Amino acid sequence: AVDLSSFTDFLRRQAPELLPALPHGATIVALKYPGGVVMAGDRRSTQGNMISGRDVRKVYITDDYTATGIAGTAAVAVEFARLYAVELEHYEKLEGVPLTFAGKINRLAIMVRGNLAAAMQGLLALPLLAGYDIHASDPQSAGRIVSFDAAGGWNIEEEGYQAVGSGSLFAKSSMKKLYSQVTDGDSGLRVAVEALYDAADDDSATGGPDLVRGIFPTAVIIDADGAVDVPESRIAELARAIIESRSG
Amino acid sequence: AVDLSSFTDFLRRQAPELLPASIQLPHGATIVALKYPGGVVMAGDRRSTQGNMISGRDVRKVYITDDYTATGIAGTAAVAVEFARLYAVELEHYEKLEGVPLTFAGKINRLAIMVRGNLAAAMQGLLALPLLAGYDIHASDPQSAGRIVSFDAAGGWNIEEEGYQAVGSGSLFAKSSMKKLYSQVTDGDSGLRVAVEALYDAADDDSATGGPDLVRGIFPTAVIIDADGAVDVPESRIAELARAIIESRS
Amino acid sequence: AVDLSSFTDFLRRQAPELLPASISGQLPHGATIVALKYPGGVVMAGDRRSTQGNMISGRDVRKVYITDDYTATGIAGTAAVAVEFARLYAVELEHYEKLEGVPLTFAGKINRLAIMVRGNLAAAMQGLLALPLLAGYDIHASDPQSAGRIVSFDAAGGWNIEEEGYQAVGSGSLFAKSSMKKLYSQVTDGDSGLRVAVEALYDAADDDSATGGPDLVRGIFPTAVIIDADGAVDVPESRIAELARAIIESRS
Amino acid sequence: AVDLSSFTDFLRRQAPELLPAAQLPHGATIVALKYPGGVVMAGDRRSTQGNMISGRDVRKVYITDDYTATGIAGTAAVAVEFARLYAVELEHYEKLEGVPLTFAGKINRLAIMVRGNLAAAMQGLLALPLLAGYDIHASDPQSAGRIVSFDAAGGWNIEEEGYQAVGSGSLFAKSSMKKLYSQVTDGDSGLRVAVEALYDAADDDSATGGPDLVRGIFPTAVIIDADGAVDVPESRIAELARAIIESRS
Amino acid sequence: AVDLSSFTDFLRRQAPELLPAPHGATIVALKYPGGVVMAGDRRSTQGNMISGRDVRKVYITDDYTATGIAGTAAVAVEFARLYAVELEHYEKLEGVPLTFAGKINRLAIMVRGNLAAAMQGLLALPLLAGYDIHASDPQSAGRIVSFDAAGGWNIEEEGYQAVGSGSLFAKSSMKKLYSQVTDGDSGLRVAVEALYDAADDDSATGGPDLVRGIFPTAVIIDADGAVDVPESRIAELARAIIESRS
Amino acid sequence: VDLSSFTDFLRRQAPELLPASIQLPHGATIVALKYPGGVVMAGDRRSTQGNMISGRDVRKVYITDDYTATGIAGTAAVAVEFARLYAVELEHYEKLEGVPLTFAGKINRLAIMVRGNLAAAMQGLLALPLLAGYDIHASDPQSAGRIVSFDAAGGWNIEEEGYQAVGSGSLFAKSSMKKLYSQVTDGDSGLRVAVEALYDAADDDSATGGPDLVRGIFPTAVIIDADGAVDVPESRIAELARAIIESRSGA
Amino acid sequence: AVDLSSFTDFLRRQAPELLPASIQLPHGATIVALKYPGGVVMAGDRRSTQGNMISGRDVRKVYITDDYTATGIAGTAAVAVEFARLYAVELEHYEKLEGVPLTFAGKINRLAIMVRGNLAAAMQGLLALPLLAGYDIHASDPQSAGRIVSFDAAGGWNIEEEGYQAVGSGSLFAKSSMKKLYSQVTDGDSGLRVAVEALYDAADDDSATGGPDLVRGIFPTAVIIDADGAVDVPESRIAELARAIIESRS
Amino acid sequence: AVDLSSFTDFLRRQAPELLPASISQLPHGATIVALKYPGGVVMAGDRRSTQGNMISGRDVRKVYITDDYTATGIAGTAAVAVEFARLYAVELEHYEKLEGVPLTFAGKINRLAIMVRGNLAAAMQGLLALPLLAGYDIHASDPQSAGRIVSFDAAGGWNIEEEGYQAVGSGSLFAKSSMKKLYSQVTDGDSGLRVAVEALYDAADDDSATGGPDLVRGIFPTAVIIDADGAVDVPESRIAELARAIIESRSG
Hints:
The structure is cut from a larger assembly and holds eight copies of chain A.
Chain A: H1 7-14, E1 27-33, E2 36-41, E3 45-47, E4 50-53, E5 59-63, E6 66-72, H2 74-95, H3 101-114, H4 116-119, E7 125-132, E8 143-148, E9 154-156, E10 161-165, H5 168-178, H6 185-202, E11 218-223, E12 226-229, H7 232-246
Antiparallel strand pairs in A: 1-2, 1-10, 2-11, 3-4, 5-6, 6-7, 7-8, 8-9, 11-12
């Protein structure tokens, strides 16, 4: 044919069935802080009005400088993160060099566009991509946030934050007010956990911090030193701060 | 044109507009009711949703409708507050016209007619599914006097001899929870705990049922009814029962 | 107009709202009811379950009611509709008696029930379905032994006076009827007839999930009514529980 | 049969035609919040038909009696018919009975008008009203202010939060007030927050128009305290607008 | 093309006729320290008629896993035999069993490849129970995995799960009874009780038939492998529950 | 047969890369007019999903080769893809054949890409492009500028009127230019009239966003004369916007 | 039994047949109206189309309805003609019964009710969208006395703050044209030119609107209204204005 | 596989994407006329394009010389019409270069009919293209009767006009009825061309989708005349002159 070095292609021709095809509902947020980007998502899954899951992870580190959060049917979303990570590492092993940021975005858009027919029938997966680009000139401005519409259209945020999922409007309105307070990764992480708190407050499909079972949003932060999972305890303690501060 | 001394029958004949005559709307509630020795208790959540959005968080769904009865209504919020008001006036109207309150059976029958006469509107989604709790003075035994009555959409009514019942989007969860917790009910305080717990369990598995909001301090509302009549349980007593449960789940 | 001394019509003329005419431009249902004739008697019994789809909505439901001193009716179908019919029909019967000083002939009681059923056809088409079984003792009959009567109604009001000796209605009625077809020769009196009846209901519950059989854990059993020359009587729970355990241990 | 002193009831009986029972011009955002000893309510001025802007001067908030105002969202025609009629209904009862309706009776009356429009609302002639009032009979003047929202079936709710909004940009306005509310300590701060929440709604919703500097068109507002209901002067809002605009720059 | 040593692929390529393409049952599964247990009812219905009363719905699929399938009985049974062959086929070709994660992933693909058919009624919703030898902690080794109709899979942190027409009742019951699980025997009692409760509130789930002597079937799995629980140990447990109910 | 068409090649080897066939953000207004020795093209920056504003920085006008630019109005993803694809298609033919396509060939090639999307466009994935170019091989330098519009079936038309627009606010923009056109006498006056027509469209259409002075987002423009296609710098537009705004007030 | 002094309310009561409401009809028109100091002017085209065929070329769509108002109607021709005649009678009827003309606001309200009462029939294509132009005697300022009111299909009415308005198939073109030409209006002559020009522009971009026919000599019809009342503009003065515009475009 | 020397067949076999057919609100509307005069034929078309009621184009050319002795005018969707005119001329010249000799007139007709017919599916969906073909036949026995006019229905059926004139498009009925009265006045290319511009004038008068002569912008119908010396485009000025003549006659 023509070789793009894409695992999605070869996987599709050789083993199309391996390709991805109801639980849904999630809120994922992402914002840029100087020399960094952070991304967090809730843990709820619902089927109609019933809560089908309370531990669901929706934010994944997909390579050393990027993470993706996917909103929509969990089954579609969980696979999607795995496939995209393999796609990225596969190109690096074949060509000995990782894809440019712009190329990582394009590959993801293609995966999303291919899924439009199935998104019209309910297997909708709307991803959010967060990355730090080493090749970019300024470290402070290195962080990137990219959102995708169902047809694969992608957009890079000059806004500073973005969200996707059933509570995304609430989350975005919340960040619109709290953004000026971000000055470093810790404040940025606070604002993200708060925006997700606000979304859970107004949307029954988004679950907020469960203090009884101790389940909290999951987060990932990414700066020049790469992508790291934020530890639970730091999130739990940022939640109680917010809760405590609201009952006040 | 016999006079049934019915306030709604009167409205129908001369004031049709007043009646919720019927030809997404806020909905979603879980109401529970149980019998304890010499008493009946009933509680309901405070949530209202439109699709996935939370439209209300303070909604009251359980109302004392006369000195010995309360009604909790689940379904479309609009249709339920109106139903409780109307039913309470219907009951007090007969009493003033006839100088004597309706027998418990009469009160049940009257509610069933209101329900059944709404089936057409309920088909279109203006559903109202009520739960009735009462204490019968006339009944021979005070301890077993408490009464719980459920209604299906066609007006069918059943008197539950089980000792508990629930209605609303989380009613299955609430009923399974009471099925395990019921043996612990021995007086009005245990019965009210179990009720608040069954409602907690319903909120845990149903996003349409809201559980205790400790941030805003909004809790389920409850009413208890024994030989001395029907009483609103004070918020604080419920709040404390909630913490008890939360504390105990952690 | 022509007065018929009919409580129904009067409700219709002045009280349309009271009438279960709830027909408009899943509700609880499901029951099995059986009835059979024994010399100088008739017996009728029905299960206690109510279902909404696959969920069990009721386990104590009573579907057989004494409607006057010499008749009883069992209604299977939608639970709300069936219960309303039983109360209404009993009032209609006692109403005519008080107005005319004399009870309706058996044929008149049948005809009246058939009109109530037939006038519910439109609503039955819409799921508000009640299909009744009527059991009665006819005092005026020349022979006391052949006095017992069983009448079934189709959804259009057609009625049929059972010549077989037994009948059933409801979701488990085929099973119950096939069972009685084999057990009927054993019926010689009220007690043997009442046993056959509880067994036919047992067999219906065995093959139909909508019909509940005897619940030994909660102690809920079918309800029955027996009617002879001395009038209609509710069979006591314990006599039925006893009869139930006999059948159960006998199947084991 | 039984007189109720209700103008609408009378109209159906003698003047059914007067009664009200695409696409049509629609779209509005309306907010309302309580400040100590008072309540304020404001609404945008835009009207759209699909993507086209059909109106830019539309008034959607009206003083309906000395202690109440109503803001209506939905099909513009049906929403304006509603404010006029509701005001007449209120004054008619007062003249017949020599005393104004209690606050709860005014709410119940509006709920009946709304509910009786459900059929029509299903077919697009929707009218979702927001009611703001000061209750003289209330035990405490500070808590005197009232905000009541209605769902399409007539269900009404008295807000215990402190603010509320209705219309196409209502989510944005509510989320905005959720953050700005603590700053409300009086009628001026409270009016500021309202105009800002409406600014935020126009920012994220093309159906809500924000302040237009070129034409000097600004949201309309009404404030109501123990001394009754009064229209905020345009100029007062215009300068509250620039303040926000300049502050966002 | 790439070989995956999958019996299923082989079938798709060369024997599509063999591939798969009466409902209502309740199946439960829970973790107890050092173990996992899974149980299912025996009823089968067609509408309101009871079509089967002996149906087995829980099968040991390899030495450390069992699957319980809820939905059309035929589809569920075919699925279990096929999955067991797929698992042993990879082992014989590669000389080593699949990792637990690989066994999950394989089941997910079989489920997902039936989504069009499930939309049309041939819905098979499986529950997987297994003990992972390679897992770091032996006590927490046991695993419960549920699948949605699209193949989405979820490993169970709550400690228990259920599927089928009475699954909500069974889940709510275990929610109360779980704290009593401290070992395989208590864990097995809580399972048979949750199934008892499901049968109580759902007519599609059959509970213990004392007249014919038919009881739920169960499988327990710990470090020594998967084993069928003997009927008598269940019948006993059943009788205790009925007596307790009174 | 072999057409040195990157697109035709893509179809045979890489159908996945194509846009494909069988609410998404949309709603843009794009204008273009001819001035002596030049052509100018400009587009708004808004993107809406229903009534919600989904984007406020969207660029919809792209220089596609040294003498042409395309503005696409419609679904945003599709429009952007169309812009990238067409530019590759044009440079691909030049590298394979060593010579750029004639203007008429560029038009025909765009028309085929549009027409081959009609099915998709019936389903909402619409992309209605506007093409602006200067023809070097044109006989007269002053009259060199070209404006071409495409209907959804690929039908193309070269306007002789002097201006054209596409998108949700296009009627407003066109009616505005109809009055303002006589004032265009050089690249600067034509760049003024373009930004004003886009102002007028944003005034009457909620899907077209006008100049955001708070965030400092303005329409993007490209001008093309004998020296090639150049992005107009933001500040020159901002200054033109404030002029118009100021002018609409009183002074 | 409440006398409204309403000709149409009388009609519905007694002779319903005469009412317009019923249930490809000839339709299509462009009507414009603008305010000039001490005056208001209104003009309409003369074409009528059925599909692509021209069914009429002399149609008058602008009518003086009383001494200080005129109405222009766009939509099905049959519906529009009926509305104008009836509205004029309704206005003069109230004046004869009550001895005093309706206030401007009352005239508006009345027209709105006629429109709204045709909504059902409009949904089925019998659409009539009117534009009202009037001079208010009781208005505080004579210069600002002129009024322009537009109606949406549900009867919603709007008084125009902007200075001009248009309705019909070519209304967008006419409105965009006036937006540019409006500053040139300083009196009834400048305002009249700006009106006919806007109608010229509408005819240029919409095939359903006919522009000036120089071969047959058919031109738009116009009415002007100032403190001295409403007048029909004479044809020749419009022909003159048309030729100016035409010549000026070439 | 047989080589028909068909450009269209080659595309269908090798490059379908290029094929006009897009079978799976567009600008459309035109009126085209054609008539025969001794030793000649003339064809003319209007310049308007509409989308609904809006005028989308005012300069559209719809009549094209397709080879030295033929022209085609196409009415329908504009994109489709333009594509057809372009495609058909290539198809004609392609056969001539491959075979060294031009198609016979009947062969040209047949080829156009196949292109039309193969568009029926698309035309059912609104992508209609109804062509009118005018030609001079060199091989005709008599020079005076050499001119040909051929119309096509949507299924590819073609007909040759013995009548002398024909029209297609939204104002074709008006144009035809006008020529019916004016035809006797035709005696040569010049009178023939007047009659044609007049028929198109009449069509514009009664159909809003057909545009008449625009004297303000100076846009007039386009025409092509074809006699033994080949097909020539009539110069704008000769038509503008003819237009004004009719316009003045119409008014005086």
